[PDB]
């Protein structure tokens, strides 16, 4: 499968698809999200009602903060790749002013509005979510590539209860180490923190945090402020709620290691530690990548083109300049 | 309780990236 799978992504890495859609073939309905370049909003192909999540980039800001070359690694690794739990490219364009990205409208929203309002997830609720990404990581890793933004925000939930993950902002086809300081905070692996170079194991230190913080209802190491949290990070202590099994308790030591020789997925047999682990002994991965296991967790649906499952933001009318801005910068784009 | 700490603290909101 794998070796089909890196054939695919190949053809596309060398030859990416471009301007595919207009702006004026799309109708604007409401703001979704923001980032710091623009935001995500729902809109609706007109001419056969379909609706889809635009992601709006202002080249101008993009080249202010000196973010040209991931921009452009984003769009590239996004149009080539195919997985059941990755987000669709459905088309990309660029006009005098943005650069926007069309992919497929996921409405049950993101993980971390469920997460919250609930509190935590049990045990086998947060097994059959951090089974789709053990298999997700397992996919881009063998297409050489690192994912570095893992976190309940990225983690979108569609109409069959399954993960969808979005934002390949800080994603990077990479052989060997590299050592950009990217991410989110209470993500972050140590090796990052105290400025190392690194490799495709802070995904899987992410993935201890993630399964932490699903189980828990907090994260394993948080503060205030970020530099009490790095302190928190590099120091290797964690402590674990009294509810956590057993098991539990055994992979997430394994996965929260701060010696590169002894994390799991780092290691002689690489992925395939993570998944004859204890806590992983009920899962049928086979059924999980087919969709066949029943989801814990459906999604209210209020219609097509509904926002209930998504915050409100304040709107703001997209400005397209009469000059070109940044031609050269995002040429390949 | 750790969980009264978090909910207490200035980060349970969506986390931007650094
Ligand atoms: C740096 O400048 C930026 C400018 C604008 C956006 C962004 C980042 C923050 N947002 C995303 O990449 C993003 C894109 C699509 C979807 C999505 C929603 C619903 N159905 C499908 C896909 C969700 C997202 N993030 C969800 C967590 N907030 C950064």
Known sequence: FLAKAKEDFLKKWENPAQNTAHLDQFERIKTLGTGSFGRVMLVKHMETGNHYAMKILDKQKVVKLKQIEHTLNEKRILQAVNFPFLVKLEFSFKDNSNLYMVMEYVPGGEMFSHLRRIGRFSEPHARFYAAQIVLTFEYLHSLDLIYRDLKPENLLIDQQGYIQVTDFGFAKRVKGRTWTLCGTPEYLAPEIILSKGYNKAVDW????????????????????????????????????????????????????????????????????????????????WIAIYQRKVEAPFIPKFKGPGDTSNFDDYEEEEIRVSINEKCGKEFSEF | TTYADFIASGRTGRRNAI
Not at chain 1, 208 to 224: H, K, Q, R, S, T
Not at chain 1, 237 to 264: A, C, Y
Request: proline share 5%.
């Open chain 1, 205 to 284: 230190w992410a993935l201890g945090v993630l399964i932490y913080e699903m189980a828990a209802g907090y994260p394993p190491f948080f503060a205030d402020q970020p530099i009490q949290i790095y302190e928190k990070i590099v120091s290797g202590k964690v402590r674990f709620p009294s509810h956590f099994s057993s098991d539990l308790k055994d992979l997430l030591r394994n996965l929260l290691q701060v010696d590169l020789t002894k994390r799991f997925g780092n290691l002689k047999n690489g992925v395939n530690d993570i998944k004859n682990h204890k806590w992983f002994a009920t899962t049928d």
